[PDB]
Amino acid sequence: LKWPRDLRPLAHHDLLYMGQISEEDRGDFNATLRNFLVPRVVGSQKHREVREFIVRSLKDLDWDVEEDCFDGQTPHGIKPFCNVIATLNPSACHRLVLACHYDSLLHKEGTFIGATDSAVPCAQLLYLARSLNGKLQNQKTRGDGLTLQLVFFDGEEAFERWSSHDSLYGSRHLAQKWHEDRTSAERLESCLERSEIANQIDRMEVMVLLDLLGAENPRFYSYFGETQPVYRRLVNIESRLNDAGLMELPRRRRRTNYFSNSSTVGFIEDDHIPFLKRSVPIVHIIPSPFPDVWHTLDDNEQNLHHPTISNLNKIFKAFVSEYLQL
Ligand SMILES: [Zn+2]
Hints:
Blueprint: H1 12-18, H2 23-34, H3 45-59, E1 64-74, E2 77-87, E3 94-101, H4 115-131, H5 133-140, E4 146-153, H6 169-180, E5 204-210, E6 220-222, H7 228-243, E7 259-263, H8 273-276, E8 282-285, H9 306-324
Parallel strand pairs: 3-4, 3-5, 5-8, 6-7
Antiparallel strand pairs: 1-2, 2-4
Helix pairs in contact: 2-4, 4-9, 7-9
The structure holds zinc ion.
């Protein structure tokens, strides 16, 4: 079966524009990122400050921002959790959903920054909203039934040994909440003709989950046949950015090959799982293998690879531009 939305290839002009980076753009991204490069364990003041920063940043851009807050039992007793959901146009029937987690792992060996996991993804989502604001606010006026939604999940990480009960606290909560929140096409703005809408989950047209980004030379694969048409757009955009010479490489005549034109057989548990179980199409932008620094005290700012981050930002900007026809 074909993708429900006809995917119009990005015009050359728009590809080039979205693949342009400046000293002020790098500076802007890095300033955003600084806010996330702090320990932010569930229950901590810094976690609260990060949550408030996400909310303020998106409210300042005139997005609708909701906090899905709840208390949940954990192996460390009751803990507070708050997912942050920002929606550009709440009324639009369908959402392109970009997501990541904003909590950091409580590491027994010491203070853990989780720079790739997932400070960089968090910053990338805010950077997209900021850098594309003009075009997004214009798109919102079209009445086309599509919008952008950003979800910053809380409580992705386990408190002790990962288990079905000790992990994915925010995403399990939100998926259940949205599944139980009934709605219909008649109550929504401009749903696609062949749409089956019974609850809020059904409005998530695709969820693109970013995780463990910021290390050098990530390798992505298509994890879900259901979203192959969307994944292939990422492959194509990356190829075109390379053709245009807009990727940062250590030497001339090299190309990035982050999005492998293949699928892989690998099972990764992450925030997409509760949504996948409710039929939400998933694109999982997570490297395989994981960064070498994964869950070590070395997952810090200096182990990030800035040229890679810049290249990913270009791919993501171009992807959002293509999907929303910005
Ligand atoms: Zn982690």
